[PDB]
Paper text:
Here we reveal that two atypical acyl-CoA dehydrogenases, ACAD10 and ACAD11, drive 4-HA catabolism in mice. Unlike other ACADs, ACAD10 and ACAD11 feature kinase domains that phosphorylate the 4-hydroxy position as a requisite step in converting 4-hydroxyacyl-CoAs into conventional 2-enoyl-CoAs.
In the first mutant (K*), we replaced the catalytic aspartate of the kinase domain with alanine, thereby eliminating kinase activity but leaving ACAD activity intact. To further explore the bifunctionality of ACAD10/11 at the molecular level, we initiated cryo-electron microscopy (cryo-EM) experiments with the ACAD11 K* and A* mutant proteins purified from Escherichia coli. To assess whether substrate interactions affect protein structure, these mutants were incubated with 4-HV-CoA and 4-PV-CoA, respectively, before preparation. The active sites of the tetrameric ACAD domain show density that is consistent with bound flavin adenine dinucleotide (FAD). The K* mutants demonstrated little to no substrate consumption, whereas the A* mutants generated the 4-PV-CoA intermediate but were unable to complete conversion into 2-pentenoyl-CoA.
Author numbering:
A (entry chain A), B (entry chain B), C (entry chain C), D (entry chain D): 375 to 405, 413 to 775
Write the structure that this text describes.
């Protein structure tokens, strides 16, 4: 679309003018769970210029392909999505509140989230059970008179340490014997200021604490009392809302991963051209050149897959495109992990040190094979859908 | 396009009605370098219905995307491309004669090729040198008074054993010291009936002789006298014509390979559903299901890459899209080889026997990593182009 | 041992003097299920010099390490094991008859097998079921008065087309409700001259019929009447005898595969040194050199694994070393397959043709991942044993 | 040997009694470049019991196989080698001073190193050049009257931050036009207390600073004046001493890596047995079980390769076994990296957090593909030696 191209050009100009020059200051600030003043100034400027809430089609008037290209543009910096209010944790919560939810819930939580006043956290993983299977959730949401009681322990809650975090969406189980085997979980809105909500400890990733994004935390809900109006949809529709939330998050992460892979490839090519070993440059060795070629091929393939998934979501819907989302979720992280490992090996001993962003990049990409579900469950789902498709064809 | 969709539907109906039922008869006939009468009847029927010369846009009025889908449809059978006059050896020669060549050359050779009266063979590989580097060609094309003399030995000439083969395009070298380092080779039209042209022996592929397609032969040119009007373009433009010929052949092969991969995946899924081992079906074992999922992901990726290359050729040109062609040529054969190996392993001991087409399929796909240039030279070319692109960006 | 070293030196001299020069004649003879006179002369010479039955410790007085080195020596030729009476099909049957069996059975069948008068065939695979799980065998061995009745269809029976094949060992099931879940199968000796035994058709491997080794056949047993004295051990001990037969066959195949890999690596290095492409030799390209290095590393690793398994069998026994045999059976075929594929790619288009033995080599190695059980069942067995070992340690 | 077995049993008892229980205290101490008192007490106890300097055959009276098993035992803990005075940085310097060096140098530096009074650091890598090629070293060691002047910048110097570090071995270049192309570098002993030696900054590995081992530092030598008696051997023998130092370090690292891989496999098996997902345990999924089986196979292979290299060094010498050392250096890190990645994936999100040692383990193993030379230079060396061997055979 013409609007998509215009917004993409404006976003590229905004990044090249403001976002990249502030990287050194942002890194020096974090070398303690909030944002420095540079990010707030950038957010104000982006609000002024209209580069705000580009992820939500109902607000920005953009399709999934246009925002796919835009998110590919903003995936080259680790704090750029937060400048445009398109960061990973809160976007899913805004989508959940926009799709499902009452007028009171929207006016109370979605508007401050849209304006950037507050941030949100999504917590559904337990530390003592296998949470890749969503039926293993043991946190309870029991009705107690006129309200609800939330009691459980959470795990890997991203962004809970941010001082602006005021609302949470908690997935817990309700005992409903008369219901089906899937109508046993519900989502509830729990304010972080409610008595009984405790932040236990932050969680590290390969020795990185990720203070820029608020960190990952262990949260305890000790008999938290919540009004009955904070329950999203009904008392047994947690799985449906989770499925609705999942897809867009995965596609946005895949676009950002494509952008990050492009940045990594640029860095690796620069290093290969610059350095000389054994009386020749690094790219003159065929192994490095073949690494570069394979990286380019993989980047092109994953970008095409993500664009296909975005077009399918546009033309059909978010519920009739689960296979494409599963395929891109399987495909992107492994390819970008291989590219990052090749770049680290090309840079040598400096590839693991703090002189380059390759080590933190590798850690973040490595966590992409576990967050939002491991790759094995997605492979099983793809196999099941493919077998159903073959049975229908035959 | 609407015409593309209509022709695709007609082609699908034609295959399902005529081509697949004749597979058993065609296989029994070959269980000796020509075609049985069933193929000739199918060719006559296809000529009547207008499903003729679909590969050439100037004749069929189709873009590269429409024919990409059509060739994906016809890639599921090993003799289907010959039914529609879209077989690998002669298509490149028709493209060469259509792009370059005089009116006399066109009227003499392209029209019988277009009508299907005769077939052609392209020979540029020598047995005693490394022919992956085109500067190693030692066959000579010397001007002798009013004509030319062709003297050399050829290698892996596909389709030379067909009785309908009457014309050849031979790549040889001419001694031109005043010319550049690339203007040393030329292409000449050599009729197979010329004295001095000898067929030495056929060449086998993993123990398969491939009599259906005319086989692969060693050809000797012993002082062949050829008129000066049989030289295509000039006396030093062999490389340019070779580059013009190369790309469309690769893209058509990639589309047919995608179709073959789809057929292989269907066979493997059928076997996995049917068989039971260790008190469960084969797909109930997670390794087989993950094989199926990875095969589907790879098929989708290679199809998207081929469609991207076809669209780029449509919108820009065959000379400004070499990078995409190189990427698809690298990507498709390895993925389809892995899929075929997985299918053979799934079928067990019967995966290598004559009860299934998987072994011949694997042999043919394995030769795709060597024919039309190995994968390593393409990887080097991709690396060079990517480095140039990075230098231009920086 | 000193005897092992002396026999190894004598075997090396015998190969270099007689076996390699006859390769061209043997190949020309087969370019129809028996042996040419050259092989018979070589067998007579080997009998005269005492290089006979080197595989059996009770006859040759050699341990498993000495014969491991000897079989590594004889693995470089495809008919060399038959010169020393150490070929794959009959060796297992000799081991079975030597370990288990009565005096009458030994005097009737093992002595002609030891002298080389007759050959044997082992058949336990069915065409219409999954035979990787041995409980799926549907062939019946019912007691009928004073004898037994064998009724079933066999599959992939190696060596059944040899005119010297006179005896077979057939695995079938007996209905014994009072027995356990494993005491349901038995092995019986069935002469090939018995009425009701039919050879149906030979089976091809990638288009190779393997006439040198007698081929692989489909055999039908149509109500074959057999005396009760032809039953090995008891009526429900088939699994035990099968387990006893399995291990030595696998270790001998692994040693021969190591030898074949060494030959393949020598051929590939010769080609890489000889040829020149793009103004440099093939080994001057780093990819080819890295292929060579990885091939050498893999060869060393698999040889060490096989020697470890042989020493373990020597010092402990064939029943307390199943884990090592499973590991070598998993490890050797994949590494040698990768080496063969690299060599084929190095040779170029000639790597698939009949000018070199690489294509037939690849086909034979590819069948090693399916014969004597697939790799997946061995991986599952290794995982089970490793979990038991960890539980015992903890 | 009997002594080797007795010392191995004593070492196993010592570890199980003292080293493992202190892991929690050691971890809590570091959660600042020296050792806590627990390690010093363990060192005193090990000195009392005679488990001291087990790496040096001239002191312990042990071969390379016995110490290979012992180092495999001590590779399961990250501070265990330091308890027995067998830690990576100083062992190479002790070997260098033991092989080469004068009586004064030995009495001054080797004896305090042997008794554990001081530690050493080896520095030969420069930050601004490619140091994988040893001819790129730009640090200068110029003779200045009665002594030497060392001027250069070092990089990744391990253990320089330890307060006990008093001596260094620096590799620099000397301008000798009359000498050969390899006699251009020399090794000199530089005390850390000499004026002009500066510690610039520590270097991180994936966000880990590794304070336990003294860290990795950037060191500057600003016109350091050193007496002429501190030069090891001559003024142009740096390469020879470097080659002598290299091999034993690699073999010890490989043995410790095998031990670490065994520990990782034990942890992964424990997790797979414990956890349950999708109504079954983790090992009941075939992918996890196949991961376990492949890990066991790889561990066995690398252990056999290391033992073969140790036996070859014992029976022939450290100069006629470079091929085996290169092969093990290539083989061990990649296999252990794959095993560690599989274990991290098995543990899920907790695989990257601080609750388990898998993330730090992966970082340390990942640096093993770069330290002591990258894998690509070793692959090139192996290819060269293999080509020489093939040429000699032919
Ligand atoms: C944990 C750790 C500890 C260390 N400790 C020490 C220490 O105590 N002392 C010390 O002196 N150094 C130490 N180092 C440094 C280490 O020795 C070097 O990083 C390594 O030798 C390579 O040096 P470099 O960084 O200059 O690599 P570079 O040469 O700059 O890397 C270029 C890359 O190109 C590739 N390459 C290079 N040559 C070839 C070729 N011929 N063919 C193909 N590809 C090729 C490789 O992937 C290589 O990594 C340590 C490093 C680490 C990570
Ligand atoms: C060259 C050659 C020679 C042979 N010679 C003989 C001979 O002399 N005698 C004889 O009796 N047989 C012989 N065979 C047959 C051979 O033993 C069988 O092919 C093999 O044992 C598997 O039998 P199948 O074909 O029924 O495999 P199937 O069970 O039908 O194959 C199914 C596939 O599923 C997979 N699979 C199976 N179980 C599992 C599991 N638990 N987990 C995961 N994946 C699994 C495997 O990939 C397997 O290949 C020969 C075969 C070949 C190729
Ligand atoms: C089924 C089939 C059909 C064919 N049909 C035809 C036909 O119709 N017409 C025709 O002219 N030819 C045909 N060929 C031949 C084919 O084009 C050649 O085999 C191919 O181009 C390579 O030629 P070569 O055998 O000389 O390879 P070689 O150059 O001899 O192979 C050397 C090997 O070295 C490697 N290598 C080469 N260059 C590099 C590099 N720069 N970097 C790294 N590695 C490198 C590659 O692995 C290559 O295979 C056919 C081949 C097959 C298998
Ligand atoms: C950086 C990061 C951020 C995160 N942020 C959040 C967040 O904001 N909110 C949140 O709720 N969670 C978050 N998580 C947690 C994440 O969602 C979980 O780690 C993940 O969903 C798996 O949960 P688990 O740890 O219980 O895995 P487990 O189930 O304990 O892992 C077991 C392992 O077994 C394997 N496996 C599982 N099922 C199968 C199967 N069917 N077939 C084969 N293999 C299988 C997989 O390898 C899996 O990793 C985050 C995690 C990370 C690393």
């Amino acid at each position: 679309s013409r609007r998509g191209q215009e917004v993409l050009t404006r976003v590229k100009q905004f990044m090249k003018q403001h976002v990249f020059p502030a990287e050194k200051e942002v890194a020096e600030y974090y070398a303690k769970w909030g944002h420095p003043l540079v990010i707030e100034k950038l957010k104000e400027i982006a609000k002024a210029e209209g580069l705000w809430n580009l992820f939500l089609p109902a607000v920005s008037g953009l399709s999934q392909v246009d925002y796919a290209l835009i998110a590919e543009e903003t995936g080259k910096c680790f704090f750029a999505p937060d400048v445009f209010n398109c960061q990973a944790p809160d976007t899913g919560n805004m989508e959940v509140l926009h799709l499902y939810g009452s007028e009171q819930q929207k006016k109370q939580w979605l508007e401050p989230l849209l304006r950037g006043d507050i941030t949100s956290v999504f917590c559904m993983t337990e530390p003592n059970v296998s949470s890749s299977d969503a039926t293993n959730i043991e946190c309870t949401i029991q009705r107690d008179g006129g309200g609800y009681i939330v009691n459980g322990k959470k795990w890997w809650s991203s962004g809970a340490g941010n001082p602006k975090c005021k609302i949470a969406i908690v997935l817990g189980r309700t005992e409903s014997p008369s219901a089906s085997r899937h109508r046993q979980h519900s989502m509830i809105l729990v304010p972080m200021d409610t008595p009984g909500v405790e932040l236990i400890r932050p969680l590290s990733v390969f020795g990185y604490m990720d203070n820029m994004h608020g960190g990952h935390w262990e949260v305890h809900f000790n008999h938290v009392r919540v009004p009955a109006s904070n329950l999203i949809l009904g008392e047994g529709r947690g799985f449906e809302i989770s499925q609705g939330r999942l897809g867009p998050g995965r596609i946005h992460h895949c676009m950002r991963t494509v952008g990050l892979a492009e940045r990594i490839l640029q860095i690796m090519c620069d290093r290969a051209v610059q350095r000389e070993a054994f009386k020749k440059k690094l790219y003159e060795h065929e192994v490095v050149a073949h690494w570069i070629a394979k990286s380019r091929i993989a980047i092109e393939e994953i970008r095409l897959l993500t664009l296909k998934a975005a077009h399918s979501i546009d033309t059909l819907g978010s519920a009739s495109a689960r296979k494409e989302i599963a395929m891109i979720k399987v495909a992107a992280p492994k390819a970008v992990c291989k590219i990052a490992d090749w770049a680290i090996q090309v840079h040598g001993g400096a590839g693991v040190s703090q002189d380059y962003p390759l080590a933190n990049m590798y850690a973040i990409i490595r966590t992409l094979r576990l967050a939002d579900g491991p790759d094995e469950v997605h492979l099983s789902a793809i196999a099941k859908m493919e077998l159903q498709d073959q049975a229908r064809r035959l």
